[PDB]
Symmetry: C2
C-alpha cells in the first residue's frame, strides 16, 4: 500500500539524501564509462598511432574508483537510514511487547515474535532500501543512457525504442503460446504416467494370475506412448528457443538495414553504432529491474502490515485504579470461573477458595490442569473470566496492575534468569531502591550465599546466558533470595522441583520455610512435607474444590487425595 | 563412471553422431557470427560504400537460421537417444519388477517406485544427454573462440588469457576472505539475537516484578549493538563489490595499456579488439559450463546405479520343481511360524491348519493380524519362514510358482481391475487359452452378468482406469467371474466388504455359493452366514489356533467366539 512511516524516517532524511546523490552519481560512474567507448573505438586504435589510447586506462581506473566510492558511500548511508529506522521500530515494538499481556504470549506466537523483532523487521528495512536503490540508481541509469544515446545518435535511438517493445511483445506472446502447449502436453504425460502407476499397483493380481508377459507387452506399448509424448514435448521446447532467437536476430538485421544511406542516417557511424548498441544492451538491465520494483515495495510493506498486525493487537488494560503499599488482607477466590483463552473447555469452575493471612494453603491437584493457572490468577496475568477475587475488600481487577504484581512474588523451578549481574537480578528494576548490603543480607538469609561466594566476582558477576549457566536449583535459590529481598506479602510456590537435589534440597526446604514463616503462603505443593506443612490443603482436580482440609483428614476420607497420597509414596 | 549403459546405448549411436555434428555447428555458428563483427566495425559502418554493410543483415539472418536449425535438429536427435534409453531402462525395470517378490513391494517402495520408473530414469537420460550436449557444444565453442582470437591477434590473445586466470584467482580469494568475515560477523549478530530472544522470553518475570523500564533500557543497549553489527555486516558485504569490480577494471586497464605502450602491438586496428573482447566475454560462460559438466555427469549417473540396484536384485525366487495341473489333494501349512518381513512380530505361530478338499474353512479375526497373511501364505507371495505348506503331500516351497498361482484364485472387495477390456480382464494374459464364448457364459453363471450386459460395448467394453470406473462391489463381481472362469481348485476370499450393496450383495452371495459349490475354500470371513457355512471355522486372533469348530460348537465354548458373535450382532 502507501504505508506511512514518514515519521521515524524524518530525522535521518540527511542520510537518505546522500544516497539520492551518491546513487545518482553511480549511474554516471557507469554511463560515462559506456560513453568512454565512443572516444576509443572511433579514434583510439590503429586509425591513430597513439593518443587517447595511452590516457584511457587512467580514465577507466578513475571512473571505477568513483564507482566504488559512490557504491560504498551509498551503501553506508542507506544502511545508516535503514538501521536507524529499524532501531526505532524494534525499540517501540519491544516496549509495547513488554506491556502486552500474557494472552498474546499464549505460546501461539512465541517463535514468530522474535522473527517479527529481528528477521521480519530487517526484511522490511532491506526491501524498502532495495526498492529505493532500484528506483534511484537504475532509474537514473535509464535517463543517463537515453541522454547519451540522443547526444550520439539523432535518429537511431527512435529506431531502437520503436523496435524493442515490438520485439518484447512478440517474444512474450510466442513464449506464452509455447508454454501453454508445453503444459497441455504435460497433461498427456501425466495421463500416461497414471497409466504406468495403475500398471504397477496391480502386481498383486499380476503375479497371482501369471500374466507377467501380457503386462510386459502392454507396458511396452505404454512406454512407447510415453516416449512419443516426451519426444513431442522436447521438440516443442527445442523449437521454442530458435523462434525467439530468430525474431531477435531479425530485429537486429532490421536495425542494421537502417544503416542504409538516406539523409536520415549513416552520417553517424564507426564508434557511434558501437556505443548505441552497448548502451542498449546495458539498458536491458535497468529496464528489467525497474518493472520488478513494484513486486518489491509491497513485498516490504506487506510485511510491515503483517508486523503491524502484531503491533496493535489486544493490549494489557490496567483499568484498575486502586493502589496499596501492602496486602495484609486475606486472599479470597469468590465464585470464579476461569476460561483459558484459546481453549473452549473452562479450566476452572466457580471456586470460593480463601487463603488466610499468614497461613499455608496447598493446591496439589494431580490432574495437572487448572492448578498452574490458579497461580497466575492471583497475579492477574490472565483475566477473570467470571467471578471476583477480592483483596482486602477490593477486587483484583479493581487494583492497579503494577501494585498487585508487586504484591506477589513468583518462584518456580524454571526461573528464567536475566542476563545481568547477579546482584541486580536480586532486585530487578528496584536495585536502585535496595542497598547492596541488603542484597547480601537477603542472599545470606536465603540459605544460598555459597553460590555467590564461590563465584569469582560475587555480587558483580554476569549470571544469565553467556554467563555462568547455573543449574535449575541454583535458579530456584536466586529466585527465592529475590523474593526475600522483595518481602512481598503474597507468595506462590510451584514446587515443581519434586526431584531431590544434592546438598541443596535441604537448603531449598529451609529457604522455603523462611519464605513462608509469615505472609500469605499459597503453594502448589507436590512434596508431602510441604503438604503436611500446609495449614489448609485444598486440592482441586481442575474442576472444583474436590477435597479440602488437613492432610490427615484428607487421608481419612478417600476422595481423590488417597490416590494422590499413594502415588507420592 | 560405470557406463554399463553403453551396450544399451549402442543401437542408437548413429543418431547420437548426427547430434554431435549438428551440435558442432551450433557452436561454430557463433564463432563465425562474432567473426562477422570484424568486417562490420573495421571496413563497414565507417566506409562510404555499403559493400559489407548491405549484406551484413543477410549474413546474420542466414547464419542465425543455420544456428536455429542446428539447435533444433541436434536437440531433437539427442532427445531421441535420451528417450530410447530412458524407455528401454524403464521397460527393463518394469519387467524385472513384475517378477520381483512381494517382498520388494514390502511398502518400503510404493510411490518412490513410480518416481524411479519416470523421474529417476529421466534424470539419468537427461543428465547424460546434457553432459554430451555441454561437452560437445560447449567445448566446440571454447575451441572455436580460442582459434578465432589467436587468428585475429598474434599476441593480444596471450596478454588477455594470462590475465583472465590471475584475475579469477584474485576475485575468488578476496571473495572468500570477505565471506569468512561476513559469516563470522553474522555469528556475532546471531549471538546478539539470542540475547534479544532471552530478553523477550522472560515476559512473565518481567511483568510480575514491574520492571519493564530496565527491560526497555537493556533492550535499547542490545538493539544498538544489533544495529552496529548490522551496519558493519552491510559495510563488509557492500565493500566486497568495489574491490572485485576495481580489480577487474585494473586488469582491463592493463589490457588496454598492452596495446598502448608497445609498438609490437598497435596493429590491432579497431574491430579486432571488439572481436577479442567479445570472444572472452562469451567464453566466460562455456568455461563455467565445462567445469560443471563432470558435476552433472556424476549427479546423474548415480541415478543409474540406483536403477541397476532396482534391476539387479533377487527376482522372485523360483526354487520350485513341481508342476501340477490341479491340486485336488489338501493344501495344509504345518508347523508354520511366519514372520512378516520387516516386522519382528510373527503374524503366524506354527499353525497346523488343514484345508480339507471341498469343505470350507474360515479364518476370522478383529484386528486382522495374521489372518490376512494366512491367505497370502498359500500363494507364496511371502515365503515360508518356518514349517511347510504341503498340498497333495507336496510342499508349496517345492512347487513351481506359476503352477501354484494357477492353483489358487484370489477374490476380494478390492481387486486391481487391469486397464483393459472386460473380457481380457476376465481372462488376464490367458484370453487365448479361454475362448470368447465361455467368458460371457462364466459371466452369466457368475450372476453378475448384468454389468457386462448393460456396458456400452458389452463384453468388449474398455473397463479400466481412465475408463468406466465401476464400484468396488462391481470389481468384486468381475473378480468372481475371473475365478469362476479360471475354475481353480483353491479359493481364497477376503470378505472384507462385510456390507450390503444395493442388489449386489445378494448376487455376490450367490456367486460365492457358485464358486464355493466345489473346490477348496479358505475364506477370510466376517459375515455370519459365511461363518456358519464353513465346515470348520478355525478363528485365529493372531495367537495361533485360538478357536475352531462349527459356529454352534464355537458358541458352546465361549472362548473368543462369544466376543466374536458380539461383533457379528
Amino acid at each position: 500500500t502507501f504505508r506511512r512511516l514518514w515519521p521515524t524516517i524524518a530525522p535521518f532524511k540527511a542520510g537518505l539524501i546522500v544516497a539520492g546523490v551518491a546513487l545518482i552519481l553511480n549511474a554516471a560512474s557507469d554511463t560515462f564509462m559506456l560513453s568512454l567507448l565512443k572516444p576509443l573505438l572511433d579514434d583510439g586504435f590503429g586509425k591513430t598511432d597513439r593518443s587517447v589510447l595511452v590516457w584511457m586506462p587512467l580514465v577507466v581506473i578513475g571512473l571505477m574508483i568513483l564507482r566504488g566510492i559512490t557504491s560504498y558511500v551509498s551503501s553506508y548511508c542507506i544502511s545508516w537510514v535503514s538501521g536507524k529506522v529499524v532501531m526505532t521500530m524494534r525499540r517501540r515494538l519491544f516496549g509495547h511487547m513488554m506491556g502486552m499481556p500474557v494472552s498474546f504470549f499464549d505460546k501461539q506466537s512465541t517463535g514468530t515474535l522474535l522473527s517479527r523483532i529481528t528477521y521480519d523487521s530487517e526484511q522490511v528495512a532491506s526491501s524498502s532500501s532495495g526498492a529505493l536503490i532500484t528506483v534511484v540508481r537504475e532509474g537514473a541509469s535509464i535517463i543517463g543512457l537515453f541522454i547519451m544515446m540522443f547526444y550520439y545518435s539523432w535518429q537511431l535511438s527512435i529506431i531502437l525504442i520503436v523496435l524493442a517493445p515490438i520485439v518484447s511483445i512478440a517474444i512474450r506472446v510466442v513464449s506464452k503460446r509455447f508454454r501453454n502447449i508445453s503444459k497441455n502436453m504435460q497433461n498427456t504425460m501425466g495421463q500416461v504416467t497414471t497409466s504406468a502407476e495403475q500398471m504397477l499397483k496391480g502386481h498383486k493380481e499380476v503375479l497371482i494370475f501369471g500374466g507377467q508377459e501380457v503386462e510386459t507387452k502392454r507396458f511396452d506399448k505404454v512406454s512407447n506412448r510415453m516416449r512419443l509424448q516426451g519426444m513431442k514435448m522436447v521438440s516443442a521446447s527445442s523449437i521454442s528457443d530458435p523462434i525467439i532467437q530468430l525474431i531477435a536476430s531479425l530485429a537486429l538485421a532490421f536495425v542494421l538495414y537502417a544503416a542504409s544511406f538516406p539523409s536520415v542516417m549513416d552520417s553517424l557511424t564507426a564508434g557511434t553504432i558501437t556505443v548505441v548498441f552497448s548502451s542498449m544492451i546495458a539498458l536491458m538491465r535497468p529496464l528489467k529491474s525497474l518493472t520488478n520494483v513494484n513486486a518489491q515495495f509491497q513485498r516490504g510493506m506487506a510485511a510491515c502490515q503483517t508486523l503491524f498486525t502484531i503491533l496493535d493487537s489486544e493490549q494489557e488494560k490496567d483499568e484498575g485504579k486502586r493502589v496499596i503499599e501492602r496486602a495484609t488482607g486475606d486472599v479470597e477466590f469468590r465464585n470464579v470461573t476461569f476460561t483459558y483463552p484459546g481453549r473452549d473447555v473452562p479450566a476452572l469452575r466457580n471456586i470460593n477458595l480463601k487463603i488466610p493471612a499468614g497461613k499455608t494453603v496447598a493446591l496439589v491437584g494431580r490432574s495437572g490442569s487448572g492448578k498452574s493457572t490458579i497461580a497466575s490468577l492471583i497475579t492477574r496475568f490472565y483475566d477473570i473470566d467470571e467471578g471476583e477475587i477480592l483483596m482486602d475488600g477490593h477486587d483484583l481487577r479493581e487494583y492497579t496492575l503494577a501494585s498487585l504484581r508487586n504484591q506477589v512474588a513468583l518462584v518456580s523451578q524454571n526461573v528464567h534468569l536475566f542476563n545481568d549481574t547477579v546482584a541486580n537480578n536480586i532486585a530487578y528494576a528496584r536495585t536502585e531502591q535496595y542497598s547492596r548490603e541488603q542484597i547480601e543480607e537477603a542472599a545470606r538469609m536465603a540459605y544460598a550465599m555459597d553460590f555467590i561466594n564461590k563465584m569469582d566476582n560475587g555480587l558483580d558477576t554476569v549470571i544469565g546466558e553467556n554467563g555462568v549457566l547455573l543449574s535449575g536449583g541454583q535458579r530456584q535459590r536466586i529466585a527465592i533470595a529475590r523474593a526475600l529481598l522483595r518481602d512481598s506479602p503474597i507468595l506462590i510456590l510451584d514446587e515443581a522441583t519434586s526431584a531431590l537435589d544434592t546438598e541443596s534440597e535441604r537448603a531449598i526446604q529451609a529457604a522455603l520455610d523462611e519464605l513462608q514463616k509469615n505472609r500469605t503462603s499459597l503453594v502448589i505443593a507436590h512434596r508431602l512435607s510441604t503438604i503436611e506443612k500446609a495449614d489448609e490443603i485444598v486440592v482441586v482436580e481442575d474442576g472444583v474444590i474436590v477435597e479440602r482440609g488437613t492432610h490427615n483428614d484428607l487421608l481419612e476420607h478417600r476422595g481423590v487425595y488417597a490416590q494422590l497420597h499413594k502415588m507420592q509414596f
